[PDB]
Design an enzyme around this catalytic site. Structure first.
Site, short mmCIF file in Angstrom:
data_model
loop_
_atom_site.label_atom_id
_atom_site.label_comp_id
_atom_site.label_asym_id
_atom_site.label_seq_id
_atom_site.Cartn_x
_atom_site.Cartn_y
_atom_site.Cartn_z
N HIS A 1 0.80 -1.23 0.00
CA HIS A 1 0.00 0.00 0.00
C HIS A 1 0.83 1.28 0.00
O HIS A 1 0.26 2.36 -0.20
CB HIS A 1 -0.99 0.07 1.18
CG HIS A 1 -0.43 -0.33 2.51
ND1 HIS A 1 0.02 0.59 3.44
CD2 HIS A 1 -0.26 -1.55 3.07
CE1 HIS A 1 0.44 -0.06 4.51
NE2 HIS A 1 0.28 -1.35 4.31
N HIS B 1 6.58 7.05 5.57
CA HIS B 1 6.05 6.57 4.33
C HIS B 1 5.35 7.72 3.63
O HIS B 1 5.24 8.83 4.18
CB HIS B 1 5.10 5.42 4.59
CG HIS B 1 3.89 5.83 5.36
ND1 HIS B 1 3.84 5.80 6.74
CD2 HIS B 1 2.71 6.34 4.95
CE1 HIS B 1 2.66 6.24 7.14
NE2 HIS B 1 1.97 6.63 6.08
N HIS C 1 2.07 8.97 0.70
CA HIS C 1 0.87 8.79 -0.09
C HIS C 1 0.99 9.71 -1.30
O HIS C 1 1.45 10.85 -1.15
CB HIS C 1 -0.39 9.10 0.69
CG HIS C 1 -0.48 8.41 2.02
ND1 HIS C 1 -1.17 7.23 2.18
CD2 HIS C 1 0.08 8.69 3.22
CE1 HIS C 1 -1.08 6.84 3.45
NE2 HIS C 1 -0.30 7.70 4.09
N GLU D 1 -3.43 13.36 1.54
CA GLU D 1 -4.54 12.90 2.36
C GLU D 1 -5.22 14.09 3.01
O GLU D 1 -6.40 14.34 2.77
CB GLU D 1 -4.03 11.89 3.38
CG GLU D 1 -3.44 10.62 2.70
CD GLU D 1 -3.57 9.39 3.53
OE1 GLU D 1 -3.05 9.39 4.67
OE2 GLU D 1 -4.14 8.42 3.02
N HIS E 1 4.42 11.07 5.84
CA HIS E 1 4.01 10.81 7.21
C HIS E 1 5.19 10.23 7.98
O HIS E 1 5.67 9.13 7.66
CB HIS E 1 2.85 9.82 7.23
CG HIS E 1 1.57 10.40 6.74
ND1 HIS E 1 0.48 9.65 6.34
CD2 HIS E 1 1.23 11.71 6.58
CE1 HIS E 1 -0.48 10.48 5.98
NE2 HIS E 1 -0.06 11.73 6.14
N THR F 1 -4.71 6.57 8.94
CA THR F 1 -5.44 6.74 7.67
C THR F 1 -5.49 5.46 6.84
O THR F 1 -6.07 5.47 5.74
CB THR F 1 -4.86 7.87 6.81
OG1 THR F 1 -3.59 7.43 6.33
CG2 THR F 1 -4.74 9.15 7.56
N1 LIG Z 1 -1.07 6.80 7.27
S1 LIG Z 1 -0.75 6.91 8.87
O1 LIG Z 1 -1.95 7.36 9.50
O2 LIG Z 1 0.46 7.68 9.14
C1 LIG Z 1 -0.43 5.26 9.52
C2 LIG Z 1 0.69 5.04 10.29
C3 LIG Z 1 0.91 3.77 10.80
C4 LIG Z 1 0.05 2.74 10.52
C5 LIG Z 1 0.37 1.35 11.12
C6 LIG Z 1 -0.47 0.23 10.51
N2 LIG Z 1 0.03 -1.08 10.96
C7 LIG Z 1 -0.55 -1.78 12.12
C8 LIG Z 1 -1.80 -2.62 11.83
C9 LIG Z 1 -2.53 -3.13 12.92
C10 LIG Z 1 -3.67 -3.90 12.70
C11 LIG Z 1 -4.09 -4.17 11.38
C12 LIG Z 1 -5.25 -4.96 11.17
C13 LIG Z 1 -5.67 -5.24 9.88
C14 LIG Z 1 -4.96 -4.74 8.79
C15 LIG Z 1 -3.82 -3.97 9.00
C16 LIG Z 1 -3.38 -3.69 10.31
C17 LIG Z 1 -2.22 -2.90 10.53
C18 LIG Z 1 1.15 -1.68 10.24
O3 LIG Z 1 1.64 -1.14 9.31
C19 LIG Z 1 1.70 -3.04 10.68
N3 LIG Z 1 2.24 -3.03 12.04
C20 LIG Z 1 3.47 -2.25 12.12
C21 LIG Z 1 3.62 -1.66 13.54
C22 LIG Z 1 2.47 -0.71 13.87
O4 LIG Z 1 1.40 -1.16 14.36
O5 LIG Z 1 2.59 0.52 13.64
C23 LIG Z 1 2.50 -4.44 12.25
C24 LIG Z 1 2.00 -5.04 13.57
C25 LIG Z 1 3.12 -6.05 13.78
C26 LIG Z 1 2.95 -7.41 13.56
C27 LIG Z 1 4.03 -8.26 13.74
C28 LIG Z 1 5.26 -7.72 14.07
C29 LIG Z 1 5.43 -6.36 14.26
C30 LIG Z 1 4.37 -5.52 14.13
C31 LIG Z 1 -1.06 2.96 9.74
C32 LIG Z 1 -1.31 4.23 9.23
ZN LIG Z 2 0.24 7.68 6.07
#
Ligand SMILES: NS(=O)(=O)c1ccc(CCN(Cc2ccc3ccccc3c2)C(=O)CN(CCC(=O)O)CCc2ccccc2)cc1
Ligand SMILES: [Zn+2]
Length: 257
Positions: free
Chosen positions: A61, A91, A93, A103, A116, A195
């Site tokens: 993504h 990262h 967008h 965004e 971001h 987001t």
């Molecule tokens: N655009 S932003 O607003 O700046 C913005 C900034 C940050 C995010 C984070 C989204 N995120 C968490 C997540 C949580 C639940 C979810 C459920 C369903 C689908 C996706 C999901 C994603 C991840 O990338 C994956 N984690 C990375 C760490 C963390 O949690 O940050 C992995 C969790 C993990 C697993 C194993 C080992 C290590 C870490 C989203 C948007």
């Molecule tokens: Zn973002």
């Protein structure tokens, strides 16, 4: 699974993540005439001198650069924040054309992209615990417009060929994120959300007023990435942005007059 297409894009996300229709979702339109100057807001403190970048990764993504967050090395403090927030990743967008991709919007204006820088509140010990808290994360958002090149971005652009498709990663050590920041730290701030899924309402947003300029060649390299994994039909990674969500019962505060 969720994405940015017609059948899995932002208008569908609420089915798997019902908080998508919640009371503090992001991004939002920043109406500059309605944001109120808050003289009690403090200067932002961006302390990135000891940042330790680790890897760059295509996650299907976006692309992200990850940092060592096992110690207070690169931290965000001050502004609207209480306590210390550690940098985890950055990262972007971006759009398929220069007139869309951000965004957040400013008086309905969309920028070509948005950076971001994602930080988590060390009082919660790890990012997974922080995402469950209303003040668990702070995201520093920076708009990109197309014009002159940003020299501090070129090291990122030049490695994107090595992470074209979902799942690919590469070593990306010794990258200095200070090279991505505009001159001014003037900002708007409001309580919001992630987001992308899970859309958790855990983010203090800090959106800088001053965009950075990047060149057409730099953004074109973003647009060459792929949403798909190696071996699948090629779908260019473009328009990976969520549109503005309802402000509801929130006030956007400005650090500046
Ligand atoms: N655009 S932003 O607003 O700046 C913005 C900034 C940050 C995010 C984070 C989204 N995120 C968490 C997540 C949580 C639940 C979810 C459920 C369903 C689908 C996706 C999901 C994603 C991840 O990338 C994956 N984690 C990375 C760490 C963390 O949690 O940050 C992995 C969790 C993990 C697993 C194993 C080992 C290590 C870490 C989203 C948007
Ligand atoms: Zn973002």
């Amino acid at each position: 699974h969720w994405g940015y297409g017609k059948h899995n894009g932002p208008e569908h996300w609420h089915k798997d993540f019902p908080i998508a229709k919640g009371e503090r979702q992001s991004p939002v339109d920043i109406d500059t005439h309605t944001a109120k100057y808050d003289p009690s807001l403090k200067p932002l403190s961006v302390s990135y001198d000891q940042a330790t970048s680790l890897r760059i990764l295509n996650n299907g993504h976006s692309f992200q650069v990850t940092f060592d967050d096992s110690q207070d090395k690169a931290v965000l403090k001050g502004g609207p924040l209480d306590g210390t927030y550690r940098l985890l990743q950055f990262h972007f967008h971006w759009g398929s054309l220069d007139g869309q991709g951000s965004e957040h919007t400013v008086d309905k204006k969309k920028y070509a992209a948005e950076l971001h820088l994602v930080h988590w509140n060390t009082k919660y010990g790890d990012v997974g615990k922080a995402v469950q808290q209303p003040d668990g994360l702070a995201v520093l958002g920076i708009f990109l417009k197309v014009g002159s090149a940003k020299p501090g971005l070129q090291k990122v652009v030049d490695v994107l060929d090595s992470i074209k498709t979902e799942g690919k990663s590469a070593d990306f050590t010794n990258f200095d994120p200070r090279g991505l920041l505009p001159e001014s730290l003037d900002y708007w701030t409001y309580p919001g959300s992630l987001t992308t899924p899970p859309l958790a309402e855990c983010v203090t947003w800090i959106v800088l007023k001053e965009p950075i300029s990047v060149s057409s060649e730099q953004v074109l390299k973003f647009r060459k990435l792929n949403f798909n994994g190696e071996g699948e039909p090629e779908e260019l990674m473009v328009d990976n942005w969520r549109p503005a969500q309802p402000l509801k019962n929130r006030q956007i505060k400005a650090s500046f007059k």
